[PDB]
Design a protein around this ligand. Structure first.
Ligand SMILES: Cc1ncc(C[n+]2csc(CCOP(=O)(O)OP(=O)(O)O)c2C)c(N)n1
Ligand SMILES: Cc1ncc(C[n+]2csc(CCOP(=O)(O)OP(=O)(O)O)c2C)c(N)n1
Ligand SMILES: [Ca+2]
Ligand SMILES: [Ca+2]
Ligand SMILES: [Mg+2]
Ligand SMILES: [Mg+2]
Lengths: 823, 822
């Protein structure tokens, strides 16, 4: 009947849409509520019997795999999943089953060794979650089967050393070398990066496997992994910026259930997944879902059914899999890789498991989760269970079962023995005029039929004029630096919020056709020599998403992935970079000292007191200076276009991997005094300390100076204009262009040229507790006591905010600084 | 045939929104691009296919795109389905005229603002004015449900319009001393406000408020939630209340690019149904003008809609055409009804356009030439809706002309009113019985309650400490909070694993070994011995794994209820940098910027113990750098009793100021770090502490030639070394209150050591960290006769808070102790 056939259609849709709500995914079965005509079952429907349709639906959607995919908007993706999930799956070969068991044996023997040999390692234990090892193995093996080049992993602490041994393939001698509290991070080896080669067992392919470094800040590494992968993909000419659509470098990202639901950086990183500036062709996510977060239950950790519900944001398919079924876990891992290869989109695997040990050393987890731990106490391991089931199903003989147990024992013996044996042993930046002229000419070498917006056309003509006649402004000097690096063969990646045009309408790195909307990148012409051959260089410029945390994390990641790239991230205003504070604190400022991991990332932070309020005034110079330690970063605030040009060229050509923090201008972009001569680009270098041009080039007399004003940034021009207005020959203004490391020798040598100075003042726009004064006021009299003893401060008064909220108050305070400096 | 119909119905319900006419600009030209005899056949409840298809097209493919089949609760899917799939009778002309009056009021405000003042184009609501009759419908529907208050959080776009036409603030207050291509134009764009909404066609009124915010888009989102939650707790409504009304409604506005890119959005959505954070569902309005400064949506997000993040918590989503203010008002009322029925978030994606540019003097056709050639052909929302009402025969020409008179009068009124405005232009000690009561409370277990065998000694020890002394840090904290509850104060404590405590020291909540039932010993102190309530309460929760949203929430909670004691605890101080935007933009600076006060406490476990650079520092140097006179109190107590007095002073001083506490980890179990009963019953907070051998023992201060100034747990190590070597020539002085510096108490303490020849600031932290960067510069300036020649003893300056090796940590710690006694 038509009514009966309709009930079947509704039944099929119910299993496809909501079957996952009844699938037997929890190996602990904590929730019992979850589970709570006969003649029609043998009737054929449109041609299969109802019982056979219902058996296929129960096997596919209500067994050990919960499939969520009907939320996906692309019908072809829903169809692809449906077809692969709704078929009579042939059980794996005994060889495949034995191989999964061997990986479970290796994982368990590793955990047993680690928890028996050392005392304080329980909090990092993978016990109850060992099925993640044959699962990761299946991901990597499937990537090798597709002929891909590398799998890059990011993960937290749980099972880290097991992943090093059984996935990366690192030897025990390297893993437990100089191996080391009830809480906190263990050995530094729980944080370091690693590289290895994975060799297929039943295939003839190999693939590179790497693991990126990370802090204890859960999920903070997520955008770093994406950036590192994208840099590697651009190097291999694969993916978005490549010749092929393979995206042959795969991000494999591990997570914990509580961190995946609560950390905002997860959503920000998922949001990058299909962006032209940030896509990596889909990430394979594995959530180690042990249904606990330290002592916190999932009902206090999230407001949704699953810890993975955030991934619905980008229409990713989600697979909830029972961690006690390593075959279903391996099968889902392979399906995930196939989906990622077919659609270049993220796949999330929610592996339901348990945490056998506590949240900290000496923890009795039944104190806060008595019910969960009374169930965990009855649980046998996933290895013993999978071995028991294979004999139960008659898949392996009793002899084969004992050999598997002696493989376990041999694996345990080997790591004890190997660690026992280990314990027994224990450049010029100036360019030629022709280079400047070429970059100028590039702004007018428009494609045939291209229509420039009438307001952009004068910018291009003025850049040709500047290249040939001088008075080069800040925005053009930046493009002269990047353009000349591209001409020399360097990859330049520039990104940030509205960075193609520039927040202050100054950059125009990308220009838009007035009639078609087609994008044109003038600096990209520098990637080709006049002979028509490539330089090897490239200009990659993007408008970022409205993120700071993920975007800064990505760019840091990108510089790690390709140390030969020039990577710049620009804040809309330096004031918004505090949204990426975790990246600044945990990776950029400290990654080198903590993990030996190097980055040459540039942060461009528009900075300056101009009356636009406390969120459009400061990049927090004082915070970056406080983070600095010898050799960790370079911190600068250039006052001239040419000095900024030389700063960027020195950074890209010095052969050193060190982050550069630049406090960049806003109104000073259009200050007509803030322009440079051609000779400043062709016959000079970066100057960490600058004197007034009247003393280095003019008829100024340094011996008339009794008051020395030390400063940095745009306030120089205001100080210099007041000096000229009042003909103050008794006053000299010295700029500190490089704030960190302090240019001690150049500063001492410059000050020695003013012998009649009776008083020295550090002049700054920022409040007394901000800017360079908190560090300079303490460091300058200590590093140079014969020069800075008695150094006094001229600044805004100390404030709890970077500035006043009133532009009227700003103007009064600015004038007060100028009147004090010349009082 | 019947099967094809079932599939057709599901296709409209699930994907009809992909074909709905939601974009007023119709930028995507590919968006729109079994038999006719079956159309007249009745299907199964018995309706013709033509009728089923008309209802489905009207409900899902007109000016409203409905997303709801992702919702796992079947009763919620059914509720939406039933209200959306009905033959909707067109509104009454009076209702249409009311919607027009709100568009009249919205456009007259924008015309005035963009004509009277220069530099206002980047904040313009032009192209998005339909958000005003939409917000009006939200608030009017909340008043119709008899609710108490609507609290709004929004960015700059249409902020003053909302002040005038939603909050009801007069023009004289909005434009008072009203003050440039970029940034924030006026402080009025950031300030909080409060008003009363009076219904037009009803007899209800409702309070309407707007919370303060920085320019950091979406950062205010968790702050709004905390604020509303505190107001709900005060009204005894919602989760911690007698009724399930949740009578205070969060109304949260957003921009399309910020809603998709900011992680704090997901973190705040994640709080929506949590017992410690739920507010009964938030009404979200996304002002989706399909642009983010100069950035197109394809570079801003990886999903079809800017609102796709809201699917995380199964919120229903309504995409509505901003050129249809009737559909916009209808969806707003439906959203309020859903929120009231299910106590869950509702998201309204209002598709509109941004008439002006991203900054003053911007020509947005430079970067979006196609969008702006379409915007240039667009007539305003008010003129379009007026023209539509004329064509549909809903209003006569006289009625349309009277609507234009109403518009013209509203525009004249603002100009005139602003023209007229321009013409005029405590003891913290408790009694022994209080300590004994808090001790006894730990053993006053409910009938049949089974204590975990490892928790029972903690309870018994607490009874012992209360009566015999040697009170440890963890108990001293509960003595402070418990005594405040006994005095009638609401105490809210939360953070990651805060019920048990990260270091298994707190046990604020204990769990029944057999049933899992929670017991809160301090909640017994909310009742007097005679049985009457004190008016106090203990609200303690395990937070989600968030820092940004959790810190934002607690800050907002203290703003919502200034009489509450609100404490947020970091698992380790090292993770608080994930909440840097809240520290920088609200906690440290809200008072100076907006006059907005908070008494929030941040508890940051801190100390060098060899657990690595992410389990060592709460970054004291960063909080000290943020501090300015009167903004915050910053402390690092060394004794349980001093921490007790610090919390009691904070809760009872009648001052709304954040308190930053650097709390211990191993020092929780240090047997020397214990206090006597008399320290709680006959003392007070001590900003400076001397060694007990000089204040209570036989020590001689005149023998001291070397003074060691320090803070925190390193004191005990310095004191133990002094004892071991009998170093009478050395004295150790602790600075318990780091900010504001206790200048007088410090000077008076140091005057008691006349023979001191050298002074050293001793700290565990690297030289560029801890208190030395600020103290090394401030102490010789504020007290030159005491600290000229002050020298530092510390770890060497580092780019990380510590070494990654516990072996390196131990060597460096011993080096500090040997230098201090060298
Ligand atoms: C950003 C951040 N916040 C807090 C912590 C402290 N912390 C360490 S483990 C833990 C609970 C983690 O739960 P989950 O994500 O489910 O992982 P699991 O330990 O269960 O594998 C927390 C809150 C952290 N390391 N990082
Ligand atoms: C956290 C943060 N990052 C960056 C900015 C700078 N910013 C100001 S407006 C803008 C674009 C906003 O787009 P959208 O959210 O769609 O709002 P709209 O201006 O279109 O209403 C940005 C990136 C900011 N204010 N806050
Ligand atoms: Ca370099
Ligand atoms: Ca207070
Ligand atoms: Mg977990
Ligand atoms: Mg927008």
């Amino acid at each position: 009947i038509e009514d009966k056939n309709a009930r079947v259609i509704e039944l099929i849709a119910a299993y496809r849409n909501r079957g996952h709500l009844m699938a037997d995914i929890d190996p602990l079965r904590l929730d019992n509520t979850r589970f709570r005509t006969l003649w029609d079952l043998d009737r054929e429907f449109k041609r299969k019997k109802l019982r056979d349709i219902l058996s296929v639906l129960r096997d596919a959607y209500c067994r050990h795999v919960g499939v969520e995919y009907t939320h996906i908007l692309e019908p072809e993706q829903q169809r692809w999943i449906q077809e692969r999930v709704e078929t009579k799956h042939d059980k794996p070969t005994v060889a495949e089953q034995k191989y999964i068991l061997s990986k479970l044996n290796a994982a368990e023997a590793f955990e047993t060794f680690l928890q028996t040999k050392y005392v304080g390692q329980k909090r990092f234990s993978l016990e109850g979650a060992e099925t993640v090892i044959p699962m990761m193995d299946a991901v990597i093996d499937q990537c090798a089967e597709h002929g891909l080049d590398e799998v890059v992993i990011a993960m937290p602490h749980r099972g880290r050393l097991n992943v090093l041994a059984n996935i990366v393939g690192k030897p025990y001698s390297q893993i437990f070398s100089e191996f080391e509290q009830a809480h906190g991070s263990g050995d530094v080896k729980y944080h370091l990066g690693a590289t290895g080669t994975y060799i297929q067992m039943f295939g003839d392919n190999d693939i590179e496997v790497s693991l990126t470094a990370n802090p204890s800040h859960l999920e903070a590494v997520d955008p770093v992994l994406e950036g590192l992968v994208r840099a590697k993909q651009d190097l291999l000419d694969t993916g978005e910026e490549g010749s092929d659509n393979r995206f042959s470098v795969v991000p494999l990202m591990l997570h914990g259930d509580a961190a995946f639901a609560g950390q905002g950086v997860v959503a920000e990183t998922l949001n990058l997944a299909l962006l032209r500036g940030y896509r990596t062709g889909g990430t394979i996510h594995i959530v180690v879902n042990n249904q606990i977060g330290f002592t916190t239950a999932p009902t206090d950790s999230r407001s949704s059914e699953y810890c993975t519900d955030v991934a619905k944001m980008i229409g990713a398919p989600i697979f909830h899999v029972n961690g006690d079924d390593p075959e279903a876990c391996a099968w889902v891992a392979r399906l995930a890789v196939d989906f990622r290869q077919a659609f270049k989109k993220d796949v999330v695997i929610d592996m339901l498991c348990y945490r056998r040990r506590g949240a900290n050393e000496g923890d009795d987890p039944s104190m806060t989760q008595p019910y969960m731990y009374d169930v965990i106490d009855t649980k046998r391991g996933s290895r013993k269970a999978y071995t028991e089931a294979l004999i139960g199903r008659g898949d392996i003989s009793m002899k084969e079962a004992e050999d598997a147990l002696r493989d376990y024992q041999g694996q345990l013996e080997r790591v004890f023995n190997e660690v026992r044996e280990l314990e027994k042993h224990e450049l010029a930046t100036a360019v030629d005029k022709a280079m400047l002229q070429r970059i100028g000419d590039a702004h007018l070498a428009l494609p045939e039929g291209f229509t420039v917006h009438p307001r952009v056309r004068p910018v291009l003509e003025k850049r040709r004029e500047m290249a040939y006649e001088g008075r080069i402004d800040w925005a053009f000097a930046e493009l002269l630096a990047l353009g000349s690096l591209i001409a020399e063969g360097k990859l330049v990646r520039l990104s940030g919020q509205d960075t193609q045009r520039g927040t202050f309408t100054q950059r125009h790195a990308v220009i838009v056709d007035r009639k078609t909307g087609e994008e044109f990148t003038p600096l990209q012409l520098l990637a080709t020599n006049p002979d028509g051959t490539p330089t090897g260089g490239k200009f990659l410029v993007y408008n970022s998403a409205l993120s700071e945390f993920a975007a800064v994390g990505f760019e840091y990641g990108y510089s790690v992935g390709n140390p030969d790239a020039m990577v710049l991230w620009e804040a809309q205003f330096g004031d918004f970079v505090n949204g990426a504070q975790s990246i600044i604190d945990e990776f950029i400022s400290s990654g080198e000292a903590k993990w030996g991991q190097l980055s040459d990332v540039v942060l461009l932070l528009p900075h300056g007191h101009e009356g636009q309020g406390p969120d459009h005034t400061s990049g927090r110079i004082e915070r970056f200076l406080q983070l600095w330690a010898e050799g960790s970063m370079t911190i600068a605030m250039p006052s001239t276009p040419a000095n900024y040009f030389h700063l960027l060229r020195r950074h890209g050509k010095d052969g050193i991997q060190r982050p550069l923090i630049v406090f960049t201008p806003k109104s000073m972009l259009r200050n007509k005094a803030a322009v440079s001569d051609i000779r400043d680009f062709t016959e000079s270098k970066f100057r960490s300390v600058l004197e007034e041009p009247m003393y280095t080039d003019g008829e100024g007399d340094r011996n008339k100076v009794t008051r020395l004003l030390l400063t940095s940034g745009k306030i120089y021009y205001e100080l210099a204009a007041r000096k000229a207005k009042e003909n103050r020959e008794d006053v000299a203004i010295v700029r500190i262009e490089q704030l960190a490391p302090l240019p001690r020798r150049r500063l001492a040598e410059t000050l020695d040229r003013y012998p009649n100075v009776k008083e020295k003042f550090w002049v700054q726009e920022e409040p007394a507790n901000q800017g360079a004064w908190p560090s300079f006021g303490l460091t300058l009299p200590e590093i140079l006591p014969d020069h800075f003893t008695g150094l006094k401060r001229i600044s805004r008064r100390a404030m709890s905010a970077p500035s006043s909220g009133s532009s009227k108050v700003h103007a009064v305070e600015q004038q007060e600084i100028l009147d004090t400096a010349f009082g």
